Design a protein around this ligand. Structure first.
Ligand SMILES: CCCCCCCCCCCCCCCCCC(=O)OC[C@H](COP(=O)(O)O)OC(=O)CCCCCCCCCCCCCCCCC
Ligand SMILES: CCCCCCCCCCCCCCCCCC(=O)OC[C@H](COP(=O)(O)O)OC(=O)CCCCCCCCCCCCCCCCC
Ligand SMILES: CCCCCCCCCCCC[N+](C)(C)[O-]
Ligand SMILES: CCCCCCCCCCCC[N+](C)(C)[O-]
Ligand SMILES: CCCCCCCCCCCC[N+](C)(C)[O-]
Ligand SMILES: CCCCCCCCCCCC[N+](C)(C)[O-]
Ligand SMILES: CCCCCCCCCCCC[N+](C)(C)[O-]
Ligand SMILES: CCCCCCCCCCCC[N+](C)(C)[O-]
Ligand SMILES: CCCCCCCCCCCC[N+](C)(C)[O-]
Lengths: 86, 223, 169, 223, 223, 86, 71, 84
């Protein structure tokens, strides 16, 4: 059922790319702040969380318009397929 | 009563009233908004649904009463008696226009026309139009076409209002959870603390007053 | 009801040990919080019971309840035995669930011990990936005795009416 | 027995009775308060709603009885028979003043007045202005205005109380976490220890007696 | 045939029966204690709410069924005679004393007296209370005064009991955590270990049996 | 009877088979990343999540087909066992 | 009456087993990702619907239920 | 839908600000005590937890008046945008 196959595969691909960007940013920031604590040999729990929050908020301010474009496109498309037979 | 069929029609309408109220009146909106408020505050049981619905019905009464009264005063006049079918039919038709106006003010015409063309079997139910030509379609449209459009048009509006009402509380939730992570108290569920903050926030805004007033003001205007 | 409540408890214990806390929902027919496993084992017991003809013993015990204690003689349930009932149900359930709880405990301690050599390893997060597979694997082995265990040893019988009920008139 | 229409009125009233109790009586406040206390202690099923609402209904009965008795005695009185519509209607109206005067102490003036402004017949220009003297305006606003203003103000005042009830438990919940962190047992969930403390505190405070007394004292006067 | 009003009273009573049981009977206490202990053991839905409510219901009947049966045996008594509404009222009231005594035994005198004042004193122009010497009123508090005062005392007793049952489980949680730290086997959540231990320990000691006896022995002798 | 026992056993057997591969790869990725973070001392904790999300989604793409063939064959089998009696 | 109740329950049991599989699988993959806070029912409901539609359940079932009463 | 877009953007801005300060105070205290452990060295895990708690509590005690005013302003603004 090429229609069910398409809609099902695209749902998962969209989950993977919508979620990837915030987690990539968070991971890279995490690594750099973890390193800096080693070369400084200076340690605390809170600095990485503090920076990660800002990094993710900026990520959302920037990309969020595109999240809307992608979701609207998919929303229309699935309805048209569901009611396509008539 | 002076006519057995007038009597029958009156009783039938009286029997259908609650479905008309539930499907063609601002009650549709007010009913939904209060339940969304309760959800956004995060309360399961309280206030009771019949408390909220009772208030919603009282408020809707003010908005709709002027039309009911106008129609009653119009129909109770025995000042003319009718020569023929068409004379009667037109006399009745012209009485509903106070309601027909109110539905046409708030529905969205593209649906109304779509349904009109659909209950007629015309041109196999849907066909293209080369030309776009508007024919005082406001007076043509049947009530049986207007009613669904109004219903959908107003449900959507309710969802919109509920969206706006959620945002302030979402802020509170994320803020509490972040300051708890700053303290490192990672095990503790925010809902134990965030709820009272929401309560006092709503109490200080006096959300019930603002909300109730604004709802009415969308339909009426008052000094 | 007694044979079914034990299998329901068993299923709740397993689904709690493997994590899975959030999966449950309140059944509207009874008002009982129902996990994913618990519903399955609770059905499976019912079908084996019906297949073995327990349905006849049910009407039987009803009839005998009328012959042995009569509405007009003020028949009454015995108090002393009623006081043990909840604890006998809990006992049976634990005694039966135990083999799975043990292996899942050994598994988690084993991972915690292993973590000593690599303290950055999240031994907790690993266990969530593992324990559900372990649970189903082990229960699949000890699954076939479930049919005889419940069908006879737990089913009530008409002979017991003598001890649980007596006439006060 | 009596006037056939008076009989109809009595039966209609008795049919609507539970919605009135649920929407224009202190039952609204007590119902909310008890459930909020259960949530503050953190219990999901104890006591049952069927117990809490039973208590709330009994406590409300004391507060409301004297008004029902006074209105009953006022109508079971053979004093007069009536000449005219205006005499009868003003005799009826003078019987409800006890209830009207109960609602007036607790609804809020500005919201009441806004609703009274809402009922007046529409005008094409904005309505002709007026100011009215106290014997109508202070003493005698209409009940179809008072009733929803009452419901809304009651809900608000209930949330306010719930807010204060939460505060001491929030204090407990924080302190206990900070002490567990001071002992280093960072991984243990503090709910397992905070819950019994909360219960101990509530029984030593004897919160049920205080709540049940003070809530009644807000309406009764006892010496 | 019989009497048509006593028929109404029978049918009415049988509709209210479950709310009376739910609000003025030891069921209130039994159903609470079990659910609290279940939460303290930390594994909800074992035993089922069906099991717990079923047992609590059965036990409540041993306490209450003799009192109802005694009342019906009091009324089915062919030797009485009456002369007036007063002489009948007295005899019907006398029939309920068997229940009244039970409520008086298990509830607070001062909260009862407070509601006994509150039914009236909105009527009263005076402060003196001595005006009836106690011997009548101390025996005859009204049942509507007794009911909520009984329920509010039963709940408090339930919490008192459950408090003392929480303590040992808390201790067990502290012991487990301290052992994991002393072993340095840090990154394991203790709940996974301690909930099996709590369960096995309580079942191996038959906590539910001792609990059931300890509850019934407030109300009966089992022998 | 034996049909009941057989069908119930098979249900657990299928759960085991289908769920097994994702949980394996999520384990292996958890071990490798945890070791790597001891071989070079870095105290990040989202990196496992970031990698294992991609790991699980990939094998859901791969096995998307066999998943539907197995479940169809099982459904047909049990419907036959239930209804075809004579 | 009790015989028909017995056999109807028996038939109803068999039909659960695929959906039971679906539910336990989904729950396991979510725990494998650590998303403990996700309610599975949201994800598992559409998979059940599409499974039943692919089987064409109502055809098979209404056929067999009638064939049990006539040769 | 400029209004809707605005409301959305403002929400995140508010979360970023209102959570910002307490994390900064906790950061600075944790860092300063950390460095102070490197001299006269004694190494103890809990001192950051003990002292940061006082930091954050005192910060909230001072600023909590501000928070309510910002929140109120936002709530009114959105209620009006919705009901207009
Ligand atoms: C909320 C309460 C609203 C209840 C709606 C009552 C509907 C009345 C029906 C109607 O309009 O025909 C009246 C109909 C009008 O006839 P007309 O005089 O020829 O205009 O009959 C009457 O004259 C009025 C009789 C109304 C009796 C209802 C009293 C309700 C009391 C509420 C509790 C106090
Ligand atoms: C309120 C006014 C009181 C009316 C009483 C008159 C009754 C009468 O005289 O005719 C009898 C008449 C019954 O007719 P009979 O059965 O033929 O005797 O009315 C009744 O239904 C009896 C109701 C009164 C008995 C009260 C018993 C209360 C026991 C409390 C137990 C609570 C927990 C329940 C346990 C389960
Ligand atoms: C995003 C997670 C949930 C996605 C569920 C998609 C269901 C697809 C159902 C059909 C799968 C079998 N297939 C591809 C052969 O049709
Ligand atoms: C504080 C978190 C709030 C998250 C939800 C915010 C509202 C949804 C986003 C609305 C704007 C969408 N956009 C950017 C496409 O216009
Ligand atoms: C179980 C409720 C229905 C039957 C009524 C039972 C009434 C209580 C009888 C208790 C007798 C106890 N005993 C023998 C020690 O007196
Ligand atoms: C967080 C994801 C949970 C997914 C659980 C269901 C797995 C099966 C998904 C349908 C089959 C694979 N595919 C690619 C078509 O989606
Ligand atoms: C959660 C179990 C795994 C996901 C697959 C569930 C079955 C979906 C329906 C399969 C349909 C197969 N197909 C397209 C060949 O018909
Ligand atoms: C920590 C907040 C998590 C929110 C998750 C959803 C993010 C995308 C949708 C909201 C976008 C808001 N924005 C950037 C338009 O303002
Ligand atoms: C994050 C912890 C502190 C949150 C404080 C937020 C208070 C919101 C309620 C403001 C009420 C203002 N009021 C009415 C007291 O003036």
């Amino acid at each position: 059922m090429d229609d069910l196959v398409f809609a099902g595969n695209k749902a998962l691909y969209l989950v993977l790319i919508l979620s990837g960007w915030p987690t990539i940013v968070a991971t890279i920031i995490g690594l750099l702040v973890g390193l800096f604590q080693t070369v400084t040999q200076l340690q605390e729990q809170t600095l990485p969380f503090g920076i990660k929050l800002l990094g993710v908020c900026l990520c959302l301010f920037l990309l969020s318009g595109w999240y809307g474009e992608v979701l609207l496109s998919y929303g229309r498309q699935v309805i048209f397929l569901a009611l396509a037979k008539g | 009563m002076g006519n057995d069929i007038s009597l029958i029609a009156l009783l039938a309408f009286s029997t259908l009233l609650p479905f008309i109220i539930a499907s063609g009146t601002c009650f549709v909106k007010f009913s939904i908004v209060f339940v969304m408020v309760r959800n956004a505050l995060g309360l399961q049981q309280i206030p009771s649904n019949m408390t909220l619905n009772g208030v919603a019905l009282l408020l809707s009464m003010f908005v709709m009463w002027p039309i009911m009264h106008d129609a009653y005063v119009y129909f109770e006049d025995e000042d003319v008696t009718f020569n023929d079918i068409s004379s009667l039919s037109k006399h009745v038709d012209e009485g509903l226009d106070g309601y027909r106006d109110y539905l046409i003010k708030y529905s969205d015409r593209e649906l109304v026309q779509f349904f009109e063309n659909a209950q007629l079997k015309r041109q196999y139910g849907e066909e293209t139009e080369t030309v776009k030509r508007d024919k005082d379609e406001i007076e043509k449209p049947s009530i049986f076409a207007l009613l669904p459009a109004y219903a959908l048009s107003e449900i959507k509006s309710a969802f919109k209002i509920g969206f706006y009402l959620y945002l302030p509380f979402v802020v509170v939730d994320l803020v509490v959870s972040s300051v708890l992570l700053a303290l490192g108290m990672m095990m503790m569920s925010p809902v134990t603390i965030s709820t009272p903050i929401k309560l006092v926030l709503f109490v200080a805004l006096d959300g019930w007053t603002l909300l109730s007033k604004g709802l009415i003001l969308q339909y009426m205007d008052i000094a | 009801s007694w044979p079914f409540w034990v299998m329901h408890a068993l299923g709740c214990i397993i689904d709690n040990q493997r994590g899975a806390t959030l999966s449950s929902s309140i059944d509207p027919a009874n008002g009982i919080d129902t996990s994913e496993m618990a519903n399955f084992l609770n059905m499976f017991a019912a079908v084996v019971y019906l297949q073995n003809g327990g349905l006849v013993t049910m009407v039987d015990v009803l009839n005998k309840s009328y012959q042995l204690c009569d509405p007009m003689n003020e028949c009454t349930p015995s108090l002393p035995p009623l006081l043990t009932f909840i604890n006998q149900v809990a006992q049976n359930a634990l005694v039966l669930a135990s083999p799975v709880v043990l292996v899942l405990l050994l598994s988690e301690v084993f991972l915690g011990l292993l973590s000593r050599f690599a303290p950055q390893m999240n031994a907790f997060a690993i266990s969530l990936t593992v324990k559900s597979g372990i649970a189903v694997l082990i229960m699949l082995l000890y699954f076939s005795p479930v049919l005889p265990d419940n069908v006879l040893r737990l089913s009530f019988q008409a002979t017991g009416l003598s001890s649980w009920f007596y006439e006060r008139g």
